[PDB]
Amino acid sequence: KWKTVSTIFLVVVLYLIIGATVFKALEQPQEISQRTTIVIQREKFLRAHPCVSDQELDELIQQIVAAINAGSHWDLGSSFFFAGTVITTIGFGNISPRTEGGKIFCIIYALLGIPLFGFLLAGVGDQLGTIFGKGIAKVEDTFIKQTKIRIISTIIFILFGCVLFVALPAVIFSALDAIYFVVITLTTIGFGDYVLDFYKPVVWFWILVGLAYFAAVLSMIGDWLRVIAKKTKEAVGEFRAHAAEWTANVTS
Template structure:
């Protein structure tokens, strides 16, 4: 309230930012186009070729019937019916899958390999998400802050001798590295082994999932020709939650670590520069004051 005069300055800040944003998007669009267009044309040609060959082999089929059939299959696929295999495929909405779906909603991953198609389902999904998304954020935060509070109980960090400062920083870094290994590197390897993906694909899947983008081009446990153990999807859901909580923990910690390292470095150079000069007035725990942008 007291700074009504700031508004023009805000407007001045927002415009360049928006400009940069749009430029970034355009840049991305151009590069994606460069990278993908040729591959797309290739696979499109190949599909057309295969279709023609199929028509040649089965002469009783005509072009139009085939096109219509293609449309039918696509609609079935979009609706979540797996057209491969036979009609005894397990339902898409058995309990495990339904649970997985609920998970993808509240985490806002939204793979989209399953999506409600009835009106009732869609309306319910909206309200479910409206409550579920904040709930999920709260839950992840509890996990994250609980762990972080434990970790950064290095309250009077500045007062301790340099050696133990160094040790603690090293320990923190080691912990972060190990945890990242365990949660972000190891599971994608398991997934790529079970699903038959390459490691690159597994890593891509993990990134797209944990960043909650969720394209849905790779989803675990959807190949009908594979036999998964029954808890596979549940385990995957747990991994997702763990990974998200881990990110919630680590992302704020990273800058802290960076800050401490830089301080150590400065100290060792003999520049006893008091960096966080004029520490904030309220008595809040110090380490968490450091803004992300450190």
């Protein structure tokens, strides 16, 4: 009977309202600075070259904006990079199909590839989960000879994982923009702003396991939310119980 979705709905809406105000607070500042300096770089280009004119420069921008729809891409390996992005639902967004048959294929290629790749990621998950189980069975015998012990183990998970899958692969995949790269990619958000050939056979496997790593990390963070959702549910429960108490005694 109890819906309980509406409350989670408003939390998400409110999370998004807070997120919005925080993003425009952080980004609309540089947006002005950058775009005041873009108006400068036209008027510096127009003044420094009387050869090109006002009416003719927009004809260049249009044909650049037309070239945005296109840009060797689609080579033997770049289309397989593209194909990986589709089934992983990463989809960096840099290259997309333009032919009507490439879209109809991409629709079928996704509807079949996403579940298929899901089974691969699931197997790599269980594969990697027992490998981690091997590493903690030894560690949970050396200094254990137990309810709070389970926290020390989860500290070493986030520690050893954010080394292999966040810190280290900065080389494989500045200091911040690497962690930013890693998180946006492995959360499958789609890392658009940035993106030897024998490189991608090993890199795409660090992706395959890093995807399994954040898949677990995201699920733990979700499990911490079920916990904190109950603590906040019971806390409000008490403070309503005593305020009702209080309102009753004060009236007498």
